[PDB]
């Protein structure tokens, strides 16, 4: 829950400057919008991207939130695993 | 670059690029440029391209040498990706600002979900000056007008190099001590707890709790500084406006089309029928790109790329008028260097030997009336 | 890239795929040796590279 | 209810009700009521919302308090699930047939598979009686005269009743001896088969023969009860008739649209030209079923929820009248607490801040043509 | 053969084959014959039966006692598989000629994608003569003439009869010395390298070194005798042309349809409407590619296999002239046999009760144009 709960606060004082909306040739972006629109990235189309867009079974603002703590639900399950993993990672037997 | 790679038959049963322009192919660093022009998506399209729902208008530069500062089709910008229909022709038009000095051959590209990168005509293009120069004001729904080429930089590098140095601490805090041989020995020899001393355990509460205080507050102060904030704007734009166009003034068909393998040029026979008022001559022959023209019916007034131009590439063997009604079957050849440089010649390879293009008439007022043809192409061999 | 750094996804995935090594090597660190700088060598690691 | 908290640009960008009519408000038990008007398929359909398809036309009731006795698109019974595709227009009517006493919020709706409840506008409608009076008569195709509401129930309750008491039987059979510690014992000590006597053995073989007697035969007296029964009726419905509507009257375009943050109402700055042969007025915006309406040129005739009415809402700069031909650019301005209240006000927080909604004119005569607008929608603040 | 076991509707609702034309119905091995016609797709085309994005043009006979010499949608020929349309009336040509003597059921048919096998109606059709005579001639874009029914023959048992007899020298190079027991004891005891002595170790080398050669040169030998040779060509083709043809000179309603089960008879009520500048009767109802005719009306000129011809089949309540304007409610009834052969009946046991078809009016001069049904289709019970 930690690990989930402190990742997008712990990011929010850098990215929040590029979340000033902006209106630019008649449709409103964020500036991070404006940054991808702008630098040009030939390989790597606008469809590819997996940002959040909306649902009619859903409620924005909060979906930050919600998100978070779902990460750190999942993200406990990840570490059991992971624990388990890394002890089977640390291991001097010879074969 | 990139694109005499592709698949022939791709290219020439994609879309179809025409009537580019390019303002201007010199440019100094913050002058803009524009690419506009019209583009066919052909309705024979591949079957392993997925049709084109979900596309988007790209560019093709290596890294952002220029800045898209606009890009339309039908009037519309188009930051996020469009839909697109089989069979419609569109208009487009990009707005590029220099940023990097150098030689760029800028191509103009359509991007398919599903499908891969659809290659338009690239043209050299020549930005001068210093790139340091380069500057990309913006004016916030706050105004407030920042520069988006450094604007909240000095906050991402103040934030990473404290959090790293945070980070390197707490790994200083314990590296002071001996850390591998003696501590082992220490939790072997049943020992583990004297390696975490009192002052050691809430050290550890310093570090937690700060990072912690560290955070809610700077989170506070920063819904301060920025208190209107919008999540990224994202989703596909459906309804995109095409032009659906004047229905061929000329109907043109092809009753029989090959190419001479080896061999720099493809020959089509075409019955063509005027239904207009004026009369009419075959201009222009254009498949992927390359633009064969008759020499004694149309100069090119657009500066199109000189590896693509065949100025006078097309020869057409009975190109006299064609007043309304009255068809005549006729005999043309596309020649030129472009039909090996570009590798359509290597249609002999692809699954697929079908072509696709488009045909420019011209009536002797001036007016260029468009039509777009397709058949198999079949090659000859010696 | 900051236009891909969203709500729903971004705060989804990397919390969850970047808690796998560090609760790897806390695993060996911490109980083999009392080493409790586990997750920092690891997110000192990725951000250096 | 539940509509409030679903993205604002969803509903507005997704399905428009309009022109609904409902033919009652208070209703007895067994009364029928009518519920119908028009809806329109936006064709700039959100990505995340997959394309109608597969959609079915539902109402929204807290449980059957009504029954649906029927529901029509284009004068088709649409009991299965139907495509309706973007772009069109459709008129719709339900007949609902009241069932249960109580205050019900009723709301039309439709489901779009892959995409979620696209929920219409709902006024509240009365029922009183007592729910015990209601009755649901059907004439089958062998008629045969039953009611719905409890035909076969008790052939369920008799049924399930009987094969329930025959299993508990086998049960009790058993559990009348003891079940845990004495037999365990006896079959730890080797002596399994002293515990399933003989008696027992084909007490067994009775149960047995018995279900499957008394299967086979109450199968064979139930073909013969009803020798005609039919599978399951099912299968989407393509063919869906729309209206294809004249195309509108009057061309208008959203120059600009805007709103205050925080506040209630929402700005745009129309150029509209009456291409009809009489003059109009522009009457209503109508935008997730909210009717911002300017008092001096309509009235609702159709009594709208007042929740969704603003019978005053809408504020025209210069709405004077509009002969043929002749092009004006207006000033338009949609306030009204619904803004609020609906939380249309909460695009704030959508990814997606465009918006979509219906515009009524009026000619002197009195014909409504309607048109619609959808552009960007951005948000101002002090 | 075979589609009396496919559901009722599902060949009710799917394509519609009618005007089908076979040149011949007796043919002599080499002699071709020609099946042409038109099928309709039925815009209500089912749920689980995929839209026909991915169709394919096959002809239904047990194994290629004919070979398909040719076949066209459109006037293109249609070797790969092709897009149709819900909605779209399509002409059609296949050109069969005859391979093998024999009484040969030979059906048009329209394979699926994610749908299934469409079938439409068959005739026999008898082929005679000697099978040993079918000849398959085909000039190569290279031409030479080869024959394409034992073309490259000799290679194939040549190259297999070749590598075959290599694998058995192989084996029997080892199966001469003893195999199981004397090399197992031998390797159980210690000694496994006993068994693979120096001769032995590269009489292996000759053939590992022997089959590589053998590759290598023969390889280089075929790109020689065959210096040209292009990848199988494959892809869907999109662009398929239809008719679109002229809309209903006669409009149709059926405000009911029904059928007697059991019974060999469908009956409809149409309400019918001459909008031509002639006047017509109602000359055929076709469903499921049984041709319900009017005797008193129409001939069949086509020669329609029999078992699906009802020459006296349609009977008209009230099947006068009908001059331009007017309108008049009409009881039809679309009896014959077929109806049981075919199963048509059998509609009763499939989840979907509805049906769909074509209706034939002639005017007095003889133009036969043709108009579309569809509603449910309700079961009547004695
Ligand atoms: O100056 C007196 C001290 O020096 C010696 O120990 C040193 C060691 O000799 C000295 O080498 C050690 O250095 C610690 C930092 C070295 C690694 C730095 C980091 C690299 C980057 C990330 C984490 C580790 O720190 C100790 C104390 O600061 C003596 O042995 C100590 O007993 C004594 O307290
Ligand atoms: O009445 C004389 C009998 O009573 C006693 O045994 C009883 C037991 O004391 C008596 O408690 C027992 O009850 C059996 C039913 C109790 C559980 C009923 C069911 C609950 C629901 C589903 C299955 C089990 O049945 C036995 C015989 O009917 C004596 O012990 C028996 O030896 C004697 O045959
Ligand atoms: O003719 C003299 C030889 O004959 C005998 O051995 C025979 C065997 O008796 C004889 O039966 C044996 O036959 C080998 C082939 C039999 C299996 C043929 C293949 C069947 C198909 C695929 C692989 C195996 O070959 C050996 C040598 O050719 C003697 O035992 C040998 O010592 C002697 O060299
Ligand atoms: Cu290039
Ligand atoms: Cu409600
Ligand atoms: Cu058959």
Known sequence: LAWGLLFYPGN????????????????????????????????????????????????????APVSAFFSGFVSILIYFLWHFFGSWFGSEKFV | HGEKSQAAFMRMRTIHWFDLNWSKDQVSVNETMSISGKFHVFAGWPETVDKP???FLNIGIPGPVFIR???????????????????????????????????????????????????????????TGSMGDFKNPITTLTGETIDLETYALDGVYGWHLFWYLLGVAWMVYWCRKPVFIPRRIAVDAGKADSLITPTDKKVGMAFAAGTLAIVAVSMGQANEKYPVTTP????????????????????????????????????????????????????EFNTASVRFLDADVYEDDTNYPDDLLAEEGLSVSDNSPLAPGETR??????????????????????????????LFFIDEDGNRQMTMVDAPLIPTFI | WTDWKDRRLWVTVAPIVSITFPAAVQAVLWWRYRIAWGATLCVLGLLLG
Do not use: C
């Open chain 1, 12 to 63: 929010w004082p850098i990215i929040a400057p590029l979340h000033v909306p902006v209106e630019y040739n008649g449709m409103m972006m964020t500036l991070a919008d404006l940054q991808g629109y702008h630098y040009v990235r030939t390989g790597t189309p606008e469809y590819i991207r997996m940002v959040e867009k909306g649902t009619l079974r859903t409620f924005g603002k909060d979906v």
């Open chain 2, 329 to 358: 079957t006729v005999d043309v050849t596309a020649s030129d260097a472009a039909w090996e440089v570009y590798r359509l010649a290597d249609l002999i390879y692809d699954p697929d030997s079908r072509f696709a293009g488009l």
């Open chain 2, 69 to 127: 500062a606009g890009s339309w089709i039908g009037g519309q910008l188009v930051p996020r990706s469009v839909s697109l229909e089989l069979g419609e022709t569109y208009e487009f038009k990009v707005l590029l600002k220099a940023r990097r000095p150098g030689d760029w051959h800028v191509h103009t590209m359509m991007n398919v979900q599903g499908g891969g990168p659809i290659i338009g005509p690239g043209k050299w293009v020549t930005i």
């Open chain 2, 232 to 283: 990224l704007q994202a989703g596909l734009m459906r309804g995109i406006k095409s032009l659906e166009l004047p229905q061929p003034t000329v109907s043109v068909k092809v009753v029989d089309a090959s190419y001479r393998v080896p061999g720099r040029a493809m020959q089509m026979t075409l019955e063509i029928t005027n239904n207009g008022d004026s009369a009419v001559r075959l201009a």
């Open chain 2, 53 to 55: 729902e979900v596309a």
